[PDB]
Amino acid sequence: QVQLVQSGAEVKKPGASVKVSCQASGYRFSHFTVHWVRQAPGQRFEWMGWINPYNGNKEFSAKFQDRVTFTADTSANTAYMELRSLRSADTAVYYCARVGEWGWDDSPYDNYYMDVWGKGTTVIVSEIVLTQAPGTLSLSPGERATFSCRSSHSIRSRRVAWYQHKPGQAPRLVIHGVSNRASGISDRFSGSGSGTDFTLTITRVEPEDFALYYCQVYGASSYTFGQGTKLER
């Protein structure tokens, strides 16, 4: 099945640059745009940009356009990301993520959620807002869990997605398009909402469910994540 395998962690001095590779297997590499996303210690996930290997289109976050270069090598099934002039605030885990498969009713960009993540590569160097609640949420297997996400703008387009993260492993997509449960995701999970307030719900909690949960608004040129809700046992 679909898999994105990244290069190894690195230690870098200030001034250096770092090149992270991302090799795809289990599908046709050039038929899916790849996002690049990072997370600095105790910060929100932060989108850097995407590349579409089919036609060479690139989209860049303004925070990173000066310092980053995306490339692709379709013979090698590999996507690359290079960041120059590293500084302290560049310590982070860097992820690649493939967009979703096109939906039979989709509008332009309805599939640009992060559908499959690589495990991430750690690099150590020597305007919509989403707010989630509660910050933490303690429960025993069996109970109902309810996650909230409030947007500052109305998300008329219904491009809200929810991700599950157990640090070390790759984030998994749980819900995209507000209410669509992603493949292989249990019946226990469902999302909902509109305009400004969205919710992820788990009817009965299994032990495999304890992790962090992030909501996201996605689109063509902007992606923002909530700060995350911790589901501890």
Looking at CATH, which topology of the largest domain would you report?
A: Immunoglobulin-like
Termini separation (Å)? 31 Å
Give the biggest beta sheet.
7 strands, mixed
**Alpha plus pi helix count:** 0
SSE series: EEEEEEEEEEEEEEEEEEEEE
Find the count of extended strands (DSSP E, 2+ residues). Answer: 21
Strand content: 35-45%
Shape: globular
**Which CATH architecture of the largest domain is right?**
Sandwich
**What is the name of the CATH class of the largest domain?**
Mainly Beta
Oligomer: monomer
Note down, in words, how this protein is organized:
It is classed as immune system. Keywords: HIV, envelope protein gp120, broadly neutralizing antibody, 3B3 single chain variable fragment, immune system. It forms a monomeric assembly. The protein has 233 residues and is mainly β. It has 2 domains: 1-126, Immunoglobulins (Immunoglobulin-like, Sandwich); 127-227, Immunoglobulin-like (Sandwich). 0% of the residues lie in helices and 44% in strands. The chain contains no helices and 21 strands. The strands form 4 sheets. Strands 2, 4, 5, 6, 9, 10 and 11 form a 7-stranded mixed sheet that branches. Strands 14, 15, 16, 19, 20 and 21 form a 6-stranded antiparallel sheet that branches. It starts with a strand and ends with a strand. The relative contact order is 0.18.
Short structural description:
The PDB classes it as immune system. The chain has 233 residues and is an all-beta fold.
